[PDB]
Amino acid sequence: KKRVFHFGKGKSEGNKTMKELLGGKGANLAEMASIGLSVPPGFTVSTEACQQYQDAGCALPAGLWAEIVDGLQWVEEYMGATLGDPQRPLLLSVRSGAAVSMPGMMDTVLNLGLNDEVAAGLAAKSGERFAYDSFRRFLDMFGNVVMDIPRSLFEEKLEHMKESKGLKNDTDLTASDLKELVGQYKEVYLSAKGEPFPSDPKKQLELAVLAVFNSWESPRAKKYRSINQITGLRGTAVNVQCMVFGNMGNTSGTGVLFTRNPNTGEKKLYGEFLVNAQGEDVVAGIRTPEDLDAMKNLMPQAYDELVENCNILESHYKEMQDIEFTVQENRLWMLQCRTGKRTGKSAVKIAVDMVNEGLVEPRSAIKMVEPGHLDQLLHPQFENPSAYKDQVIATGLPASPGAAVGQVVFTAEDAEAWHSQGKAAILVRAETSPEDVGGMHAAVGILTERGGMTSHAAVVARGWGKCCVSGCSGIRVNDAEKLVTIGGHVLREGEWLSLNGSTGEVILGKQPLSPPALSGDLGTFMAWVDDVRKLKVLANADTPDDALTARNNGAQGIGLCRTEHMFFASDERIKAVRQMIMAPTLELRQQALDRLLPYQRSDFEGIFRAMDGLPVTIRLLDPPLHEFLPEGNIEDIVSELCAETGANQEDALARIEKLSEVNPMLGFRGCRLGISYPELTEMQARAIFEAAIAMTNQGVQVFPEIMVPLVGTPQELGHQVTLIRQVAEKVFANVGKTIGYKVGTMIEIPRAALVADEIAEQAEFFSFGTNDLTQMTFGYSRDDVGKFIPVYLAQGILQHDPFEVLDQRGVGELVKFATERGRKARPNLKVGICGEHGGEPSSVAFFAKAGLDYVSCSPFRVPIARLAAAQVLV
Amino acid sequence: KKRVFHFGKGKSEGNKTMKELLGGKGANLAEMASIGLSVPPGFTVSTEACQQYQDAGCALPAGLWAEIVDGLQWVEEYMGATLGDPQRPLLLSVRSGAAVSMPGMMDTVLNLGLNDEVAAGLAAKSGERFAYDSFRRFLDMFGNVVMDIPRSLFEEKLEHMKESKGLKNDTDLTASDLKELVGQYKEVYLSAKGEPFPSDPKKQLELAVLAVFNSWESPRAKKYRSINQITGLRGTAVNVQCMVFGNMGNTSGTGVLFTRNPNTGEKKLYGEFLVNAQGEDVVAGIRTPEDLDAMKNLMPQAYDELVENCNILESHYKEMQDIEFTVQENRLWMLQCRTGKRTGKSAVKIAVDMVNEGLVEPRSAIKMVEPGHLDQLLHPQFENPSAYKDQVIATGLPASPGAAVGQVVFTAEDAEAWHSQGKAAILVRAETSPEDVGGMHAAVGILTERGGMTSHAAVVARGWGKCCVSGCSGIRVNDAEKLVTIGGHVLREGEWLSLNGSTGEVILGKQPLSPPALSGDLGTFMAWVDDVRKLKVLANADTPDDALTARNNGAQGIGLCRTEHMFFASDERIKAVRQMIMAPTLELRQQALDRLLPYQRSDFEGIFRAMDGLPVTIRLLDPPLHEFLPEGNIEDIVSELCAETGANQEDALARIEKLSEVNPMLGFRGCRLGISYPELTEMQARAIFEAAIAMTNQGVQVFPEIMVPLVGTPQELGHQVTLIRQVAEKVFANVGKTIGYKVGTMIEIPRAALVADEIAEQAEFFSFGTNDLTQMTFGYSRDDVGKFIPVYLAQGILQHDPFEVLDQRGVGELVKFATERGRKARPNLKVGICGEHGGEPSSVAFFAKAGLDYVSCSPFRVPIARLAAAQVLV
Ligand SMILES: [Mg+2]
């Protein structure tokens, strides 16, 4: 067969590889039939037949029809039913389908082959009500999709019926009413077309075939191929398959199931069956489905076939399946099959079980768990979330995934108090500012009134993998009365509240939180992931606790420890930085600097203790100094600064003005500051090495790395590196001990990428700051472009927000260029990236292909990065 | 001669091309002697002799000394004087000199060959006072430079003399005192060295030679060659030349002159002569020089030789010369010669005259006028600035070159009032802000108290080529009493004041301003410049007047007309922009937009009228909208906004907050704004084409070009270009006429350079915004990096400020890449640059070599750009 290919259980003319000719659906049907699946018989008319059709002036090419007839006879012989025969009726389904997804194609046409006589022959076992209802629908469907008759013309007839009979829910019409409606519908053909409904089944088929071919040249189909650049294709195929029913007595039925539990992964058929009826019934309230056992009970012969079909599906497709099947008088029929959707929990278990069952190897199992699946297992989740549907009192934005349960509080201070007592608090505030960070961190969940997916609470919460429901308009926080009205409900300080950051749901009361996992499957799965990936995955952390959390998540070290964050850790430390900034003499400045030394030395010791055995990369002071000044009205900033440092009103104002900048992103900061005030870098370097030594003397293994930020020339880097090495030697001489360490730089200035070869002579490693690199490369001030990014995305100007998904064409090109030039100068140059791009799958895949050595992201994104670093190689 | 080369008038063993062996000075001596110049006889010991010396363990290589003796005998025979002979004495000068400039080399040693007897033989015609004084100095010089004897040891003897005699100005010592001092100095040799001063002339020479060779390996010489990467050189040469005197009677003398007037260029010897004496005398107050005629009078034979020497110098070196000469008993001797420094006025005249005299061709004349020379002729200048030395009452920073004379005023408003009456005003203010721009522009000169070379007044003033003296600390402006105290002096409103922006001088009264030129030489010179250059030079102008000024300066069009500047032109226009911004409904917004239309349409008509015949490139709204908001306390900004627009306090504050940004350089501006509010670009495009048509109907030739700013993708550009073309066609259809025009883009985002090929499919021209490109490439916020650039420059981290001198290695690489990729996509793509780099010589040279089509700079920088665009090809 060259233009028409039939198929059936264990028989098919085409095979799974003919996506071009048979089309995706046609090729898959051949595949399904070829492996022994109980698929109803049918045939496919090649895409080549469509092309010949279009060229011949949209006319049916010579010989084709002869083949189509050849194919149906085979189907008729296979089924033991003939087209247009009331005693042994054969109804057909006609579907389109090209090689790739394609809109504007003819919609599916069911029950083709009906007429007055066949309709009565169908009412025989399936009943009059259904037979004539199907006939009414078919006349409409076939009439509109094949004969191009407006739907309104038919509904125009049906409405009058119930408008006179007295109903609106068609499920109320009778067999005779439908018979009468069949008569009215046929008049529509005569009125609109000028000729009667084609009662000859073969005429229907022919018109259906031509309609599908014609569908290829539909407006939407053409637009898509020109508004989504495509070519070659050559046309669409037509899939004709025999119809089957489950309403032909108590020996028939329809059902749906997953070859495995989509929620837990348990290896057991999960679904439901409906005896003597079809899917429609349920939707109306006409019928209520049972569980699969009813099928094993009433139809053991068909059930056994269902099990063999399921094992064959998993055995051949190597994947859990979601299927739709029908049992027609003890005979099982496999209709639609597709990879089953599932929870992360289910995804990991199924992947591991299939490896243990010897169905697939690790390399393939890795592709069975999507980043989205793995992320569900990284945050807390509710046991039975369905049981709280009535307790839900509001829905806000799902700013940050995960379930949280705790007592409501209204200040960062109170969330901190709760945390200090080892208790769970839900911080509820109008919106958050950098002043609530401590409390936001202390709470188990955050709920705000204003702000969207990019508000302060959402962003910060996502960075910690902490549950957060944002922009929940239906809430009013009464700071003064210690209460919050949520959806008219009043919650007072101390009462329990639940939050689902994945849905944005605000649940009243304390819902159960799913107990921790004991399976061991995630551990097994992740071991295969770690075996396959070449990229190392590090974490960005600034405190001992985050370092520990990163390690428990599998981080191989810390790629970015931000020293400025360490000073923002407490009011006392911030005040200390301010004292240094306001110091009126060099003696008090050094005195203030010395205080910064213990803080730093102390924090690194704890960080080094937590990362015992792993490299820890510390970045020097990054922000401009004004970021350490209090915020608010100039009057209050001055008042506060004088009270905290001793400066008088005059010098306080002068200094604030001197530290003010027009574009703080690109001013007096980073190495520019460490170069102009070398004592700053000497202080931090001193703290790093003394902490490193002190821990090494306690048996801790320390691999310190110092990163110089915002370098644009090799001279800036060489200056800081020289300073760092001089301090290293002094400290090692004073302590009488020496340890290894590396000095490197953050590559975030476009110029640094351009002169990367020279910068590599001074740097032992490259740490890409793609966030800032993107800012400078796009000339985008992330804090301010939010005002037009949405417009750019909606108008097709941007495909993705460059700050979330690495811009491979632009920013990525500078990343590749810098990596190549740096490595030519220093062959063993370690190159990596630190930032959210280091935790975003498509970006991680790019970094892997670009040849980087590692990525570094937030502690809870680490497992996601690991997963993505493996999948790109598989 | 292989290691020693003699030379004299018309005789030389070496030639001008042996810079390697003879060294720069040695080769030039050979050249001078080779063309017939009356240079005293001498010889040069090759740099190869020095290398042999160093290798032989700093020992004199075999045969060398024999040659040195051979050379002096020749010199002795040439002069008819012998070394170490009191009756016919021969004194020598010993100088070092490698192939290239080299510090740490032996300092010049004069009068070598002296001793007791020769000293007396010298007192014969030159006198006792001089002979013994020279002997005292030589003992010290030779002793310190050749014998390494501390100077302190000698001054230690001289001081005691006057300390006992009773003087401090050596010019007071007598012949006998010096004779006695000669005795004391010789004791120093015995005390410090352990042996007496070498009285044998040949011993002196030998030691002198070795000292010079040794000088090559001096600390400073080595540092320079290692702290200024150099190699190959191979050593230094030694130049020995016969000494000559002009104090041997009234038949001798010394003089200096320029072969042409260094101030005006007049082709006449300009200098002075001193009869029977040497240069020293003048410095002490011992003698006062006459004019050159005294020489022609008293020594016609020598004068005639001087004229032939001068003609030979200009004829061979093709350049005006500054020389030092000595007449020893009727015999003329040419000592030092070098290209003469001169004013711009002189530079242009000399260059043109040498072409007319047939001495040089245009291509060479072009190199005779430096940018610095040409700039002097582009601004107003004082006639006789020396005559005002007593009227100078203060000196501030020379923020902007040019002379200005006008009446003192203290407000921008008053300078504007003065300008409106066609009168000259000098605006005197503490410092300036963007609010004084109108008055600053109206004044003929600006004087501020605070601020340096980068203050607001300095920057703006330089942009207009307007005279400005900045940071003049010695002034206090009494706004309330309409007066200013300058250096204790009181100047009241209306009194005359003069300013020299080139020196920073504040002159009391009204000094004469040099009358305009009538020569025609600058016109001639510039015609050769324009013939040679390939790059076109355009001007950046936003008003009809600046467009006219640009044209009078030779601009070939306007490469950048900034539309936002047009709105900042008056309070009324600014208020109109604010009304658009605060409009509460779309109807009032369009109403406000329409008002912006006449303003725009009106200004372009005037600009098009002024550039009749030349292309005019207009850039769409560039700044973020908040730049159009009033400045000050938030309370006043709101009050003012409500009063001017009708908004209430609530909506005013909300909108200000919404327009606020963290980094205004990279926010919601440029095409981002024109894309999100298309009506803005439709309004400006409409104004452009209607103005273009309206002028075309009046006989004006208009070549409008529209530039889209801040593009980072081809999609942003395509969106704006589509809008611009739709408006073009509507306007042409409404008016019933069509004209040509181009649409292009400003390339200033690094990413734009990376995807330049795609952007060229939409753009017909590329306009590089290197200022912003530099900002984003370096990650430098020009407004804020001033705080550490000075440190970077002093520590060698940066060679130049990237905003003043194009960073060829980094920014330039993106410029080359964008140009090449853009042109591959659109072969005839016009590529240029707009900004101060377009007026900076080294930057313009780079742009020319990079293949750009044009540069565009400020109106008064246009001639400088033209000049630089020619010199890089010559
Ligand atoms: Mg950064």
Ligand SMILES: [Mg+2]
């Ligand atoms: Mg710009």
